[PDB]
Amino acid sequence: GKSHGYRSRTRYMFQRDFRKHGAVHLSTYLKVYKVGDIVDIKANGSIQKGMPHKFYQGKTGVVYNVTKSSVGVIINKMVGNRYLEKRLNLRVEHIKHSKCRQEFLERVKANAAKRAEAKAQGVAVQLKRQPAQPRESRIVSTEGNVPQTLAPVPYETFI
Amino acid sequence: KSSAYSSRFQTPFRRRREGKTDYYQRKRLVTQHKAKYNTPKYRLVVRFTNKDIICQIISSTITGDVVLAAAYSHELPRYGITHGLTNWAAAYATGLLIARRTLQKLGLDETYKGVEEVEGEYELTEAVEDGPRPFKVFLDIGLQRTTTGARVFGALKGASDGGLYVPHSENRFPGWDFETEEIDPELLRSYIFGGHVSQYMEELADDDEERFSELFKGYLADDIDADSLEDIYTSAHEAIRADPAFKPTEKKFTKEQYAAESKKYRQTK
Amino acid sequence: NHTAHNQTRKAHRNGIKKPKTYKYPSLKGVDPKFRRNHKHALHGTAKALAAA
Amino acid sequence: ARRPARCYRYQKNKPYPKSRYNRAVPDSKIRIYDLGKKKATVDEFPLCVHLVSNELEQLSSEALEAARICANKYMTTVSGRDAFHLRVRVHPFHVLRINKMLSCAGADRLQQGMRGAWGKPHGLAARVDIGQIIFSVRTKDSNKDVVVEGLRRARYKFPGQQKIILSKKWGFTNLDRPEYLKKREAGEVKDDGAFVKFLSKKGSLENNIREFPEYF
Amino acid sequence: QNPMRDLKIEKLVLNISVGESGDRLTRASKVLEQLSGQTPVQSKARYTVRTFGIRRNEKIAVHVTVRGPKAEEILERGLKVKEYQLRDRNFSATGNFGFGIDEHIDLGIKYDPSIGIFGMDFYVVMNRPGARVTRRKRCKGTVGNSHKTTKEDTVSWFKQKYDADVLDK
RNA sequence: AAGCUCGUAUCAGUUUUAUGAGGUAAAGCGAAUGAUUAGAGGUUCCGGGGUCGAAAUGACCUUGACCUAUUCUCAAACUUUAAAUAUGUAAGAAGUCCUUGUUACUUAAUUGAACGUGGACAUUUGAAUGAAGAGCUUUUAGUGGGCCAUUUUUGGUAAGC
RNA sequence: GAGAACAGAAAUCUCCAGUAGAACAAAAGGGUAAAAGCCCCCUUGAUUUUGAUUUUCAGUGUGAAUACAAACCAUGAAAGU
RNA sequence: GGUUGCGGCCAUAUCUACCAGAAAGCACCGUUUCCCGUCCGAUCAACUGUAGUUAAGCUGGUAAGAGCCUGACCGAGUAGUGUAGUGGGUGACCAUACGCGAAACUCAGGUGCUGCAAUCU
């Protein structure tokens, strides 16, 4: 008989990191959570009260409700030919803020600054990113790094 | 030990190795209802060394706890007490001191006055009417075993009586009868003062007079007899109501001559 | 007996549609203790703007 | 009721060793993996010959035995028992299964078709790779002529292309001959009954000086 | 030398292992109520057997721990029963020892006529001042090898105190 | 199929930058659990034997055990470690910052939460490429026996199974 | 592992090591050490009202669970649960 | 800098063996009248800080130490792997092309960092 449980296929998913068993450090219980915050999901088996389903392990959602010991996140789930809003309730132990946004916000802070700086400076500025452009010309000095001839090695003396 | 033991050993946290904190307790004292987002949660740390008392008011950050106010028993001599610094009465006094200190640090010394006349009664701080609420702290007794009649619920009482809303019940005060499940305010008023020690003193003073000296050698300094204690500790109380502020010591050295000596004992690599 | 061959194609023909978020979403699952106070707050703001 | 070996040659089904899930399994026909002068020092037999595979297949417990004996009777009978040390390097841990279309056992004509065609175990195999030792022989430099032919007589008793290598290494060490002498004239070597114990330059100096006192 | 390093005795245990409950054990308990002043505690059993006939949660043995100078007194009046003589096997590696006895009136007790005869084990442990740090709740800490009791410390203390005769056989 | 509201939105079977999750391939077992070949060094008052023996908490052979330091080989239902491929999210106007309004929730509090007013930034409005328009609704058909190929893969000796 | 009369490989008693190799009703996997385990104290949140949500899923049921609200209770010094 | 209370990151902090530690501090220590808990004031409670010490604990040093951490012209661009071919081969398997890219080994170096309050020659 086939089993389809709330925790099937979780031998290795919810078991703690090596040598990180035990209580949870308090810096999970002090990170404050507001709505709109973008949080990544990662369960620990030590806290069974508030757990997510194995689907939402790995995912990333946006908070919409904040209660005692717990929060609520909206995750969009592909099923069939569309996505569905899933309003699930978790405890704060199965959660961490996403650093993607903490890296985007500082960039906003920075480009706003140099935008307001260029208005004082009397210059125009680029603040769109651009990808890894090709490499430009150069001149390679040959003074100490004079080329060492190479050649393929054989199989004999190697085996 | 073998190698595969110490390769796999999970070290507990540092303060659990040191035996100095219970994180099971710390979790439940520190956490707040997340809907109270960044409001802190103030603790009344109270600790009992061998010949000193610490009382501290502690909020919590991610980069370690923060002290709002602090009160050690080694500053009661400023208010008149010179002996028995690890005493139920001293604990009451110290709790009262930290209470009154904080309550004026904030601007609530006048509004919540506590109980300026003690009787040993179970009286929790009430809220003022159409006005600011009382300061709500909690209590962590470290690792101490809660037992009725301990020094630490003395400081619980002292803070409760100074004003800053420490919620508690009576059945770990002294004088509380396990049988009828009620309290004996007279005995508690005694214990607030030297009620459990003055009796021993004035008992030995006509039972065994030399051992009285062996112990209370310092009470024979200024000729402190076993009826002076009400008027000692109550003057201490009034003094603490009066000027609870923390006036620190004078530093004989500016913290660099202090390091200059110990650096030539520290035994570097 | 459960071939999944040709389901992704059928999905992607009429497409996989994102849910089309809105502004001012629903408040059916939030703390009612916050819901009530919000309801009382917004009327007050309405009134305060009714004059100014 | 032995199936041939050409049915169980290729590494097709992922391994099914003896365990609590597969308790009832026959023992192998190879038990002795060490032959010759076992208790002989690494100094006596410097020369090491190997037998390598060049394909990826499965070796039977009985073939390993039959090649073992075919290499033993030759060397023992031309050179002697205390001339060589042979190590069968591979162990058969994979288990071979067999349907055994049993026509009976419980009632009238029963157990037909392949309803529930899982296998009853009937053999053990050794999974082998592209470049992997099987026979590792250790002798002097005066007996390679025998060792080669002993291995060449064995490669007939199991399938595939199995090529013979004359190792640069001393004995069953990982070190080459002259490096071993650099260590032996130095005090970097200590003897065990069947092997060696090298010296380190990390560790407790007292425990490292008690041993290798010829060093320092 | 130093104070707070001499092997001050800490306790002594008086075990009696009957094997079966009844009035036998109450007579085994009325023997210590006067030799100690401390009401003993009856040891429940732990496992089962057919030979002794024991089962779990049966009180088949008693013991009591005594400290202070009363332990010294008992041991003083219990070693003169052994003619002050003890052997080397009796001393453990951990620095504490023990020995058994049969005639519980050798100590010199008022023999109540109904208790009869039955033996008794003594085990005596001693340590240096400062082994609280294994017991206290806050800031436990093992003790160090420069302060730790040993068999050789024990026999030396036992040659000095109790005046001589450890049969170091 | 009928269309409806709009007109290049903010969408995409795609890449990049940033940030997360995984426990497969490989690898390892002188690292855990299990499996396994070998000898060597020890230990016993203590598993068996043998000589010396009145005996031994006696001695020596010896094989078993365990203990130590190595050594050979393995794991779909073992693992410290840990890829490739595939995968979640973000890349702004529904934004950022300033100011200060409401509330019966919250705070020790004139604290915080949530939603706001009024301001400034509106040009490269904050990566690449593309866009044959984007979004939305009603209704109904036929189908609901599937087969083949590369690669991964389970049974089976194997099969055009 | 070291030790204590009868007492022995094993009753009881004492110390040291001991990251879990124990236990947690029951399969297997996970999880757990001032505990989630062992002992004790008080107890009935195994309660009332009806809703939102997750899993299986048509995003119907049923079953089981998660997080809040309003009332009443227990426990505890208290947080808290 | 030393120490204490509360702590954050939880082994660079652990483990083992030895040595040292002025100051205060911490501690060990001293007594059971009382609340209190024990068979045992050992634990726990309360009392004096008064009697006595640095032996312990604690902190710091040491070690071609175990362990852990970090990083590499170590291994290895190896193993594995995505895509491709009317490529090789009886086949198993393999090579090549465009790309991603490990682990174990080996070597070197490292051995707690720090926040609030108080306090000490």
Swiss-Prot record, chain B:
Tell me which SUPFAM superfamilies the record gives: Translational machinery components
An MF annotation (GO) of this entry: 5S rRNA binding
Q: Which InterPro entries match?
A: Rbsml_uL18_euk (IPR005485), Ribosomal_uL18_C_euk (IPR025607)
Pfam family of the protein (one): Ribosomal_L5e
Keywords, ordered alphabetically: Cytoplasm, Isopeptide bond, Nucleus, Phosphoprotein, Ribonucleoprotein, Ribosomal protein, RNA-binding, rRNA-binding, Ubl conjugation
Subunit organization: Component of the large ribosomal subunit (LSU). Mature yeast ribosomes consist of a small (40S) and a large (60S) subunit. The 40S small subunit contains 1 molecule of ribosomal RNA (18S rRNA) and 33 different proteins (encoded by 57 genes). The large 60S subunit contains 3 rRNA molecules (25S, 5.8S and 5S rRNA) and 46 different proteins (encoded by 81 genes). Component of a hexameric 5S RNP precursor complex, composed of 5S RNA, RRS1, RPF2, RPL5, RPL11A/RPL11B and SYO1; this complex acts as a precursor for ribosome assembly.
Protein family (similarity comment): Belongs to the universal ribosomal protein uL18 family.
What is this protein's record name? Large ribosomal subunit protein uL18
- Source organism of this protein record: Saccharomyces cerevisiae (strain ATCC 204508 / S288c)
- This protein's gene is called RPL5
Curated annotation (Swiss-Prot), chain C:
For this entry, list what GO says about its biological process: cytoplasmic translation
Query: Transmembrane region positions?
Result: none
- Keywords attached to this entry: Cytoplasm, Isopeptide bond, Ribonucleoprotein, Ribosomal protein, Ubl conjugation
Output compositional bias ranges, type Basic residues: 1-21
Q: So which domain of life are we looking at?
A: Eukaryota
Crosslink (Glycyl lysine isopeptide (Lys-Gly) (interchain with G-Cter in ubiquitin)) position? 47
> Region labeled Disordered — which residues?
1-32
Q: Does Ribosomal protein appear among the keywords?
A: yes
An example of a Gene Ontology cellular component annotation for this protein is:
cytoplasm
| Pfam families noted in UniProt | Ribosomal_L29e (PF01779)
The free-text function statement in the UniProt record for this protein reads: Component of the ribosome, a large ribonucleoprotein complex responsible for the synthesis of proteins in the cell. The small ribosomal subunit (SSU) binds messenger RNAs (mRNAs) and translates the encoded message by selecting cognate aminoacyl-transfer RNA (tRNA) molecules. The large subunit (LSU) contains the ribosomal catalytic site termed the peptidyl transferase center (PTC), which catalyzes the formation of peptide bonds, thereby polymerizing the amino acids delivered by tRNAs into a polypeptide chain.
- Describe the subunit structure: Component of the large ribosomal subunit (LSU). Mature yeast ribosomes consist of a small (40S) and a large (60S) subunit. The 40S small subunit contains 1 molecule of ribosomal RNA (18S rRNA) and 33 different proteins (encoded by 57 genes). The large 60S subunit contains 3 rRNA molecules (25S, 5.8S and 5S rRNA) and 46 different proteins (encoded by 81 genes).
The family line of this record is: Belongs to the eukaryotic ribosomal protein eL29 family.
**Other noteworthy facts:** Present with 51100 molecules/cell in log phase SD medium.
Q: What is this protein called?
A: Large ribosomal subunit protein eL29
Curated annotation (Swiss-Prot), chain D:
Glycyl lysine isopeptide (Lys-Gly) (interchain with G-Cter in ubiquitin) crosslink site(s) = 39, 100
Q: Where, by residue number, does the polypeptide cross the bilayer? A: none
Q: Keywords on this record?
A: Cytoplasm, Isopeptide bond, Phosphoprotein, Repeat, Ribonucleoprotein, Ribosomal protein, Ubl conjugation
Q: Which PROSITE patterns match?
A: RIBOSOMAL_L10E
What are the boundaries of the region 2 X 15-17 AA approximate repeats? 166-215
Nucleus among the record's keywords? no
Pinpoint the residue ranges of every sequence repeat in the record: 166-180, 199-215
Q: Which SUPFAM superfamilies match?
A: Ribosomal protein L16p/L10e
The record's Gene Ontology cellular component field reads: cytoplasm; cytosol; cytosolic large ribosomal subunit
The alphabetized list of GO BP terms reads: cytoplasmic translation; ribosomal large subunit assembly; translation; translational termination
Q: Which residues carry this modification: Phosphoserine?
A: 142, 204
- Subcellular location, in the record's words? Cytoplasm
Query: Which InterPro entries does its entry note?
Result: Ribosomal_uL16 (IPR047873), Ribosomal_uL16_CS_euk_arc (IPR018255), Ribosomal_uL16_dom (IPR016180), Ribosomal_uL16_euk_arch (IPR001197), Ribosomal_uL16_sf (IPR036920)
Where on the tree of life does the source sit, at the highest rank?
Eukaryota
User: Per its database record, what is this protein's job?
Assistant: Component of the ribosome, a large ribonucleoprotein complex responsible for the synthesis of proteins in the cell. The small ribosomal subunit (SSU) binds messenger RNAs (mRNAs) and translates the encoded message by selecting cognate aminoacyl-transfer RNA (tRNA) molecules. The large subunit (LSU) contains the ribosomal catalytic site termed the peptidyl transferase center (PTC), which catalyzes the formation of peptide bonds, thereby polymerizing the amino acids delivered by tRNAs into a polypeptide chain.
Q: Which family does it belong to?
A: Belongs to the universal ribosomal protein uL16 family.
What protein is this chain from? Large ribosomal subunit protein uL16
What species does this protein belong to? Answer: Saccharomyces cerevisiae (strain ATCC 204508 / S288c)
Q: Which gene encodes it?
A: RPL10
Curated annotation (Swiss-Prot), chain E:
Q: Name one GO cellular component term.
A: cytosolic large ribosomal subunit
Which GO molecular function, any one, fits this protein according to its record? RNA binding
Q: Which residues carry this modification: N6,N6,N6-trimethyllysine?
A: 70
Q: Name one GO biological process term.
A: translation
Q: How is it modified after translation?
A: N-terminally acetylated by acetyltransferase NatA.
Major localization listed first in the record, in broad terms = cytoplasm
The protein's assembly and partners: Component of the large ribosomal subunit (LSU). Mature yeast ribosomes consist of a small (40S) and a large (60S) subunit. The 40S small subunit contains 1 molecule of ribosomal RNA (18S rRNA) and 33 different proteins (encoded by 57 genes). The large 60S subunit contains 3 rRNA molecules (25S, 5.8S and 5S rRNA) and 46 different proteins (encoded by 81 genes). Component of a hexameric 5S RNP precursor complex, composed of 5S RNA, RRS1, RPF2, RPL5, RPL11A/RPL11B and SYO1; this complex acts as a precursor for ribosome assembly.
As for family, the record states: Belongs to the universal ribosomal protein uL5 family.
Q: What's the miscellaneous note?
A: Present with 39000 molecules/cell in log phase SD medium.
**Name recorded for this polypeptide:** Large ribosomal subunit protein uL5A
